[PDB]
Design a protein around this ligand. Structure first.
Ligand SMILES: CC(C)(C)c1ccc(S(=O)(=O)N2C[C@H]3C[C@H]4C[C@H](C4(C)C)[C@@]3(COC(=O)Nc3ccc(I)cc3)C2)cc1
Length: 354
């Protein structure tokens, strides 16, 4: 394959894709070294600090903390999540138009240095607030909504736990499809009909499960709270009239810089299975959001594109079962796309109408 392999069964660890949670970060770090307690206090108290109007003054009194004591990937990912949440809270405040156009240097410099190390933009992205923003309540119990929590929220009542955790559980459901991908390509190389069929049916089954998990969003997110509260903190400064030149990262760049806020295009799940199934100004935007995924996940998506076409293989075999299994995967992925559009309508377009 174009996919680098660790062994005959498992893809390379260099893709940072976990067998159990997929593109999500496995067992995220929850605590930083004591050195960073001042950052953690602010992030853990964002709801009451934003609500009381205390957040900005608190950030402005922070001392400068070097990033050199964040020595491994998980601590760096946690620090990025912490600093990114503080940054969105600092820029947008309570979300009433009182924006800050300069991010103070004692956040901007460490945030930007950590972002450079991880090759992610210095703005909150999906890999922060969903893929790394979670824990198990009971380590001995499975990955279920009842047994999990987020690490950070923005405002009390913003429904961030529901929005982030349901998204994460969709990613985890997709993980059981991602781990079958090498089997698909081995089965094509070996001309193993049943192996390919069972792989495609498993992928379909897991993507169908992912849609069923996605349906839970309605039980844990209120449309008005999402649109009027949470959406503020997922908004960016690229083409935004409130920050028309972007944000000044004090002490890192002289001039303001534009970075985009959140997009569903930041989940690698869509492109992963679009490419696998051959069903790939919107192209430019799509590729830009790819640069907001972790670089290892970009590399996985690129390796997938270098592989033979599953679609053309299946459609050449005169094999109803293979085609039905392939069609079941296409249907499942299209249903995820359609549901995303339904969520955009109910949680953004309609509330905006009001
Ligand atoms: C407000 C905003 C435009 C960012 C958005 C709108 C609708 C949806 S969603 O509910 O349609 N859906 C959840 C996720 C569930 C399914 C559909 C994909 C999925 C395959 C995993 C979703 C991916 O989620 C995200 O990429 N989330 C995200 C991205 C950046 C940030 I910073 C924070 C969160 C999409 C998600 C986000």
């Amino acid at each position: 394959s174009g996919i680098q392999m660790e062994n005959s069964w498992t893809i390379s660890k260099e893709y940072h894709i976990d067998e159990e949670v997929g593109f999500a970060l496995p067992n995220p770090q929850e605590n930083l070294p004591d050195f960073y307690n001042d950052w953690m206090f602010i992030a853990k108290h964002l709801p009451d600090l934003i609500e009381s109007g205390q957040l900005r003054e608190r950030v402005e009194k922070l001392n400068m903390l070097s990033i050199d004591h964040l020595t491994d990937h998980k601590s760096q990912r946690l620090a990025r999540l912490v600093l990114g949440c503080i940054t969105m809270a600092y820029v947008w405040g309570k979300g009433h138009g009182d924006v800050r156009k300069v991010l103070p240097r004692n956040i901007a410099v460490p945030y930007c240095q950590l972002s450079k190390k991880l090759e992610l933009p210095p703005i909150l992205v999906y890999a922060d607030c969903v893929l790394a923003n979670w824990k198990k309540k009971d380590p001995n119990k499975p990955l279920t909504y009842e047994n999990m929590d987020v690490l950070f929220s923005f405002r009390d009542g913003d429904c961030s736990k529901g929005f982030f955790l349901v998204s994460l559980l969709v990613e985890i459901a997709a993980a059981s499809a991602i781990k079958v991908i090498p089997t698909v390509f081995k089965a094509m190389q070996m001309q193993e009909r049943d192996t390919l069929l069972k792989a495609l049916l498993e992928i379909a089954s897991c993507l169908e499960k992912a849609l069923q998990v996605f349906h839970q969003i309605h039980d844990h997110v209120n449309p008005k709270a999402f649109f009027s509260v949470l959406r503020i903190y997922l908004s960016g400064w690229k083409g935004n009239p409130q920050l028309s030149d972007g944000l000044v990262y004090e002490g890192f760049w002289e001039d303001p810089k534009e970075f985009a806020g959140g997009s569903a295009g930041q989940s690698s799940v869509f492109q992963c299975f679009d490419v696998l199934l051959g069903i790939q100004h919107a192209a430019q935007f799509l590729q830009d959001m790819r640069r907001y995924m972790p670089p290892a996940h970009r590399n996985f998506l690129c390796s997938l594109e270098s592989n033979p076409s599953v679609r053309e293989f299946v459609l050449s075999k005169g094999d109803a079962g293979l085609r039905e299994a392939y069609d079941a995967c296409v249907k499942a992925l299209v249903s995820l796309r359609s549901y995303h559009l339904q969520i955009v309508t109910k949680y953004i377009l309609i509330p905006a109408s009001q």
